[PDB]
Structure formats: C-alpha cells, structure tokens
C-alpha cells in the first residue's frame, strides 16, 4: 500500500488536520448535548406549556421545522466581488483583520477549545497567539480548524436568514447542516455571553428551542417558531435576520464549504450588485448551463 501512496503536501495535511480538529469540536458539543438531553427536553417542554395540548407533538413539529430549515450565508454583492468569490471554488472564514484575535478568544471560550489541548490535532486548531499584524503565531494553525458562519433561515426570509450582511446569500445543501453547531444568538454578542450551554448540534434542536429568545418587542423568535409549528402562515417580522443578538439563529459550519459542490442556490440581488442586469443574467445563465442546475437565481 505504501508503495502506491502518492503523498500529501504539508499545506494539504495542514487543511485535513484542521478539518479533523473541527469534527472533534462538533463531537465535543454533541456529547455535551447528549449529556444534558433530559434537562434540555424538560426545559423545552416547560417553555412550550408556558406559552401554550400534547407538548410532545408540538415540540417535535418545531424540531422538524428547524431541522428542515435552509442554511444561508448572506453577503453584499455591491461591496465584494462575488465573481472573484465564486472563482475561488471554496468559501473561507476570516482567518484566511484585528478582529480575528477577539474572534479567536470568543471561539476558544464558546466552543471550549481548551478541552481539546491534549488532542493530536490541537497544534492545527490553536493560533498560539497573534502577531503584530493580527496573524497567528503558530505556523501550523489551519484555517479549516475554525467554522464557517451561517444563519438558520427557518422562516424563509425574503433576503435570507441574516440580511444584515447583504441582500444576496448562498443557500447551502441540507446535509451541510449536519456538520453545524447552532446558537440562539450570535456567539460574539452579549446576549450569548460565551455560554457554551447555549450551543446545540443538528440532532439536539430542543436545546435551541429552550434557549431561543422570546422578546416582548421587535422580532420574536419563540412565538414565530411556535406559530409556524401550528400551521399558521404569517409574514416574518421586518427585522428578521437584521441584528446580531437575537434576530437570527447563528450556525457554525464545522467543515469546508466548496463552490459549487455544497451550494444549492445563490440568490444574487439585482438592486444591490456591482454588475448590471445584462451582466448578472449572463453570469446566471453561464453558471447554470455549466452545472446543469438552477444554482444562480436572480431576484
């Protein structure tokens, strides 16, 4: 076998070791949710009876809605060149920028990354501090070790799940959600408070339901998910997805996102774009005929 094996360049080994670290982060959060599965369900049923019948049936309906929701990554087509982004054949987080240092600290405290210090892939998921240029000191720190952020658009927003970052958005395939951790608030906000117990996986949406917001003004997440489970149609609040703390369910994709392999649709905004109508229609028709899918959707 060893005779036939070609080998791997260090930059490729570095990416794989990072992805293996990220899968351990997800497995760490999933084990946390399996440990607290009873108290989470009891807390979720407590909230359902507090609002509203067989709470077990209503909870299952809300879990099936959140699981069958679409995963969106919003962007501003007028401020970034989506053409340069699509040609990269891969989506990358911010580690590939003085905010990264704080983002590393948030990710280290939110995902309990210090609990993986004894892992054989820890040297590839630890920045080892940041240099003067806000770059990691560790020469082995891999971009793939940190998640790609998205939003769980369970209401099918007109401009995606987090329109605060642009009117355009990628829609990822549903299987990508199985590699995601979920939070009721953006993990970089004060309402999240670096609370690891607020993180759930794709198989423990009951934690997301018991921890989501029930604000008395503005967009209400709990009441929206409850009414959608009761087969009531309604227009989502005008601030759905706008606002980092509590106005969207933050998702963390632990794994790489390739274009267009992990992409179901790309909704390019016509009114917010650096390209003209004729140019955007050409890009859509060109990419669609090349993939034999309806990936690029202008709107």
């Amino acid at each position: 076998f060893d005779e036939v094996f070609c080998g791997l360049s260090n930059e490729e080994r570095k990416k794989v070791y990072g992805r293996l670290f990220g899968k351990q982060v997800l497995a760490h959060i999933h084990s946390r949710c399996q440990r607290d599965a009873d108290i989470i369900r009891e807390k979720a049923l407590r909230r359902i009876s507090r609002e509203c019948i067989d709470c077990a049936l209503l909870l299952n309906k809300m879990v099936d809605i959140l699981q069958n929701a679409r995963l969106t990554i919003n962007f501003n087509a007028a401020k970034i060149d989506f053409v340069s982004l699509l040609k990269n054949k891969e989506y990358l987080n911010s580690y590939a920028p003085a905010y990264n240092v704080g983002r590393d600290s948030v990710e280290t405290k939110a995902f309990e990354l210090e609990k993986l210090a004894d892992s054989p892939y820890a040297p590839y998921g630890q920045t080892g501090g940041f240099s003067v240029a806000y770059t990691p000191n560790s020469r082995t720190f891999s971009t793939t070790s940190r998640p790609i952020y998205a939003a769980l658009d369970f209401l099918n927003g007109e401009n995606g799940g987090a329109s605060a970052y642009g009117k355009s958005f990628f829609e990822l395939n549903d299987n990508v959600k199985t590699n995601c951790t979920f939070s009721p608030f953006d993990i970089y906000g004060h309402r999240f408070g670096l609370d690891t117990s607020k993180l759930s996986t794709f198989w423990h949406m009951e934690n997301l339901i018991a921890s989501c917001q029930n604000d008395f003004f503005g967009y209400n997440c709990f009441k929206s998910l409850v009414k959608m489970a009761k087969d009531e149609k309604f227009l989502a609040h005008s601030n759905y997805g706008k606002g980092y703390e509590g106005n969207y369910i933050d998702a963390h994709i632990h794994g790489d996102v390739c274009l267009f392999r992990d992409i179901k649709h790309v909704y390019l905004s016509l009114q917010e774009n650096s390209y003209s109508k004729s140019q955007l229609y050409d890009y859509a028709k060109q990419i669609n005929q090349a993939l034999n899918r309806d990936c690029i959707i202008l709107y």
Partner: protein
C-alpha cells in the same frame, strides 16, 4: 471526477478508510456526528468520497447527492458476526433507493487483520450479494490499518468509470 458515498454500520471503519487514503495515516476515533468529505487523487481520477456517519435517521437529506452518486462503498466489520445481518439490512435499504439504481457497489470486508474475521466469501454470503440483479457490484477484503485492499477497491471503481 467520481463521487463516492461511503456508508455502512458504525465502527466498521468508514472514517479510517477515508483518511488512510487521504493522509496515509490512522486517524484517532472521531465520532462522526455529521459527515466527512475528502478528495483523493488516484490514477488521474479525483474521488470525492462522502463519509456519511449515519443516514439511518437522515435519508431525505442526502437524496440531493444520490442523482450524482457514481459509486457506493459499503464498509462492513468482518469481525462483528453479531451485526453482519444488520449490515445486510442496511445495505438492502441503500440498494432499494431508486436514485441509486445506476451506481456501482463496492463492499469493503474491513478489519481482516483480526483472527476471527470472516473472509470475503463468507461476507458475500451473509450480505446476499450473489442474489442481487442489475447491480454492478464487487467485494474486497480490506484492512484500513495496514492499507491492504484499499487501492484494490479503488482500482475496481476506476474500471467501472
């Protein structure tokens, strides 16, 4: 390019087979909560292998990829005699999918280094491969630790392309 869905019972050796082909190493046991995906270049062919942790509870989420699923690698623990029939039932459910009727099936009789492991013939008899019709299949005795049989199965997939 060839798209491969690597499925099978847990603890069979799916993740180990994937990253032994990718890294040449034996990765530590990482419970596959979601799924792993790696591209392996072999004989000028780019195998994109999706290591699905357990689609037993998420069948509709992966039917998007079934239409472009060119190969199915089913890994079975050749030492787990108490669960070999369980693997057969899961294999039958994977073969009864209409969107996978044109895909090839490669069975990996994994963990052959263990003393009580069944050979490829005994696994072929317990899974019922000889009773299959209109399915281009093949079974290979493999050991993800040492790496034996891994490239033999990849050679078979390359020929079916």
């Amino acid at each position: 390019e060839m798209r491969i869905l690597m499925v099978g019972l847990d603890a069979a050796g799916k993740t180990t087979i994937l990253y032994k082909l990718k890294l040449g190493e034996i990765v530590t046991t990482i419970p596959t909560i979601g799924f792993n995906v790696e591209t392996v270049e072999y004989k000028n062919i780019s195998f994109t292998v999706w290591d699905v942790g357990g689609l037993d509870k998420i069948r509709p989420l992966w039917r998007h990829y079934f239409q472009n699923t060119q190969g199915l690698i089913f890994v079975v623990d050749s030492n787990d005699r108490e669960r070999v029939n369980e693997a057969r039932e899961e294999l039958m459910r994977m073969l009864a999918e209409d969107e996978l009727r044109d895909a090839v099936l490669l069975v990996f009789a994994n963990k052959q280094d263990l003393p009580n492991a069944m050979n490829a013939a005994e696994i072929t008899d317990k899974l019922g491969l000889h009773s299959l019709r209109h399915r281009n299949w093949y079974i290979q005795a493999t050991c993800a630790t040492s790496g034996d049989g891994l490239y033999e199965g990849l050679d078979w997939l390359s020929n079916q392309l």
